[PDB]
Structures are given as structure tokens and as C-alpha cells.
Enzyme design. Structure first.
Site, PDB file in Angstrom:
ATOM      1  N   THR A   1       0.823  -1.199   0.000  1.00 51.98           N
ATOM      2  CA  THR A   1       0.000   0.000   0.000  1.00 51.98           C
ATOM      3  C   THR A   1       0.862   1.256   0.000  1.00 51.98           C
ATOM      4  O   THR A   1       1.749   1.409   0.802  1.00 51.98           O
ATOM      5  CB  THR A   1      -0.969  -0.111   1.164  1.00 51.98           C
TER       6      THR A   1
ATOM      7  N   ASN B   1       9.017 -11.234   1.667  1.00 54.19           N
ATOM      8  CA  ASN B   1       7.647 -11.620   1.349  1.00 54.19           C
ATOM      9  C   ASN B   1       7.297 -13.117   1.455  1.00 54.19           C
ATOM     10  O   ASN B   1       6.167 -13.512   1.243  1.00 54.19           O
ATOM     11  CB  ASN B   1       7.286 -11.058   0.008  1.00 54.19           C
TER      12      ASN B   1
END
Ligand SMILES: N[C@@H](CCC(=O)O)C(=O)O
Lengths: 213, 173
Positions: free
Chosen positions: A1, A208
Site C-alpha cells: 500500500t 515476502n
């Protein structure tokens, strides 16, 4: 984001401001890409109270551009896992929108991104990258130029590999800096646009994988 | 630096580290607003509400929550976003439509409402101004550092703060 919020005490025309905000936003925050994964939640706001009086919309648009842009490079340098900032500058596109389309394709290429990480002058991958924009049939590989920093690797003038051998070495040098520049001309019309991103490190994969974000 | 900006930050248990993760950025003075957002098909409810708040080009602040994006959290998630957005406006003595909401972090995870509830009940106007540093930290998730930037133009100041370095290729309008 992506989240970003800008705050000023400048009085501006509400109309001119939105319009101004949009043009800066498209050149900066709408021009950056780490993983291509356009979030569910991006949000870019500017708050403008008149508290300091009337600023020249022009001076302001400049100021904001300078600001968003600093934050954008700041984003790309900090790219999750990144070791290097990739600045892909496209010109000669048919229009600006093609410029950015070609920019984005390049900086979003995993193969480009890893080559920049490994410091491997694998410019042919930047060719594959452009090539990916297969619906733009006015991209002519004969007319297209490529450069890394200030070194043009394509098109091949003359014969053999010695022109490519020296200067591929020169590209390997430029890659060693913390900010790589990819230059691309299409030779179509005046469309220009710069996009930003980063090398794809293995840190990117570890972050990740091992964390839930 | 710019006039009439105050910054509220605090821990609310978005992650369990006691880090500032709840920001309210507001203006003691009516502000004309300009904003663009994701156009994702999973736009979170924070976004929908913002699009609404800025419809009149008229807004005085934003409450931002980091380490939970509040997305794909169904009806409940939409309900908490109404709830957090309204209760921030209200704690500050402001009309709903003059306050926006933005939330970043994991997807599919319900807010810690029990905790946010209790913080809200204390929320009030920060005295003095600025603090954009605290705001730039308080919004940050996989970012390794904060991101601030400040510019002078014709007697006025313009500050900016940003965040995001993964799940990042904005296509905002
Ligand atoms: N949505 C991401 C934001 C990436 C960042 O930290 O910049 C989290 O989790």
C-alpha cells in the site's frame, strides 16, 4: 500500500489545485512500481488551508512536483529488499502515454530487475522488455535506441562483438552505483516519460516469504 | 511547519509492539482538499469512504491506521471503517464528511476494535502544531525508514509524508 498525504497553508483555487494535484500525481506516484502489485488501498491526499495567503499556483505545482518526486525516489530506494533504484527514461514515443507504457514494462521486468541487481550488463533483456509491448506495432527495433547511464548498447553500428564487449563493460561499471538509469528512444514522435522502480533482490523474496505482509 | 496542522499519534495494537500505529492528521482550519485513490476491485472500505468525503473537495484531516489494511473484511470490516471514521471526526468536534480514513497492512484480518474503541475515548486535539515526523513513522510498515519532505513557496510551507515499498505500483484516480 501506498499512502501519502501533503499539507500546506497555501490558499489556492480549489479547481486549479485538483487539476494541479492530478498532473503531479501522474508524473510521480503514478510513475513508480516495485512489484507491479497495485494495492487495494492506495491513497494520496493534499490538504490546503489558506492560512498563509495566495501562492502562485505555478510556484506551487513546481514545489509539489519537487516534493512528491523526492518521496517517490525515496520509495524506490527503499523498495522492499532493494539494493538499487531503477530510473527508466523513455522518449520519442508516439505520445506520452506510450512512453510510460514502455517505461513501466521495462522497470517491471523481473529479468531486467535481476540483471540490474547482479550488475550484469544484460541489455538484451531491456530489448525483450520493449518487445513485450506487442500491441504497439509502431515500435520498430531498427529505430529504437537503448542506453544504461550514458552508454548506448543498441542499435549495433558495424559488425562483430568488440563494440558490445567494451561498453558492455562500461555498463557494468555504471550499474555498480546505487541508482541505475535506463534510456530508451523509440524514434516515433515526441512522447516522453520517466518511470521508477528497483532491482529485484533475494531480500525481496525472503521478506515476502518469511513474513506475512 | 505549515500553519494549522496538528498530528495525533499512538499505539493501538495493530501489531503487538506498542509502536505508534494510529495517526490523525488534522487542520484547525477548513481545508480545500485534493485526492486520488486505488481503483482496485478489492478497494477497501477506507477508500470508498474517502471518495465520499472528498466529493465536496472539502476535508480537514485523515486518520490512518498501519499494520492492518482492513480489506476483504466483509460487512464487519465496512462497519468498523464507518465506526473508526465517525468516532475520530466526533472526538475532534468535526463533521463526518470533513474527515477521511486510510488503513495499511495485512489483508483479511479484522481490526482490533476492542483496542481502537478504548483509544478513541481519549482522543482529542493535540496542542501545538506539526509533528509530521511522528506521522511518517506511525504510518510505516515494511518501509525501513520514514519519508518526509518540506518546501517553501511564497511565504507558505508544504510538507509531505509517504509510505510503501511493497504492494506498490499506484494507478490512482
Ligand atoms: N501493504 C504493504 C505495504 C508495503 C510497505 O511497507 O511499504 C504492507 O504489508
Amino acid at each position: 500500500t501506498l499512502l501519502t498525504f501533503f499539507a500546506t497553508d497555501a490558499r489556492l483555487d480549489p479547481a486549479e489545485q485538483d487539476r494541479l494535484f492530478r498532473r503531479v500525481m501522474d508524473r510521480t506516484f503514478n510513475a513508480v512500481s516495485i512489484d507491479t502489485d497495485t494495492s487495494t488501498s492506495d491513497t494520496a491526499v493534499l490538504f490546503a488551508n489558506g492560512l498563509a495567503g495566495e501562492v502562485d499556483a505555478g510556484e506551487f505545482e513546481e514545489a509539489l512536483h519537487t516534493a512528491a518526486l523526492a518521496l517517490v525516489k525515496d520509495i524506490a530506494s527503499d523498495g522492499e529488499g532493494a539494493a538499487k533504484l531503477i530510473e527508466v527514461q523513455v522518449t520519442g514515443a508516439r505520445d506520452d502515454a506510450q512512453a510510460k507504457r514502455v517505461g513501466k514494462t521495462v522497470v517491471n521486468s523481473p529479468l531486467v530487475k535481476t540483471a540490474v541487481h547482479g550488475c550484469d550488463p544484460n541489455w538484451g533483456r531491456v530489448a525483450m522488455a520493449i518487445g513485450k509491448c506487442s500491441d504497439d506495432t509502431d515500435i520498430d527495433q531498427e529505430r529504437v535506441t537503448i542506453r544504461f547511464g550514458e552508454v548506448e548498447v543498441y542499435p549495433p553500428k558495424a559488425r562483430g562483438d568488440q563494440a558490445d564487449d567494451a561498453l558492455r563493460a562500461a555498463v557494468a561499471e555504471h550499474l555498480r552505483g546505487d541508482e541505475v538509469v535506463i534510456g530508451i528512444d523509440l524514434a516515433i514522435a515526441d512522447g516522453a516519460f520517466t518511470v521508477y522502480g528497483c532491482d529485484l533482490t533475494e531480500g525481496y523474496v525472503r521478506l515476502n516469504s518469511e513474513y506475512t505482509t | 511547519t505549515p500553519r494549522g496542522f496538528v498530528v495525533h499519534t499512538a499505539p493501538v495494537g495493530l501489531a503487538d509492539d506498542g509502536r505508534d500505529d494510529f495517526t490523525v492528521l488534522a487542520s484547525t482550519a477548513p481545508a480545500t482538499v485534493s485526492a486520488v485513490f486505488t481503483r482496485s476491485r478489492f478497494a477497501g472500505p477506507s477508500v470508498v469512504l474517502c471518495r465520499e468525503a472528498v466529493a465536496d473537495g472539502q476535508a480537514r484531516g485523515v486518520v490512518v491506521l498501519a499494520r492492518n489494511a482492513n480489506v476483504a473484511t466483509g460487512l464487519e470490516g465496512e462497519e468498523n471503517a464507518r465506526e473508526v471514521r465517525e468516532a475520530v471526526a466526533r472526538a475532534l468536534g468535526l463533521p463526518e464528511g470533513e474527515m477521511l480514513i486510510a488503513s495499511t497492512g495485512v489483508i483479511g484480518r479484522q481490526y482490533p476494535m476492542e483496542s481502537i474503541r478504548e483509544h478513541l475515548k481519549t482522543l482529542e486535539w493535540p496542542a501545538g502544531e506539526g509533528g509530521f515526523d511522528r506521522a511518517a513513522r506511525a504510518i510505516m510498515t515494511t518501509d525501513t525508514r520514514p519519508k518526509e519532505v518540506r518546501v517553501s513557496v511564497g511565504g507558505a510551507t508544504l510538507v509531505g509524508i509517504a509510505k510503501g515499498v511493497g504492494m506498490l505500483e499506484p494507478d490512482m484516480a
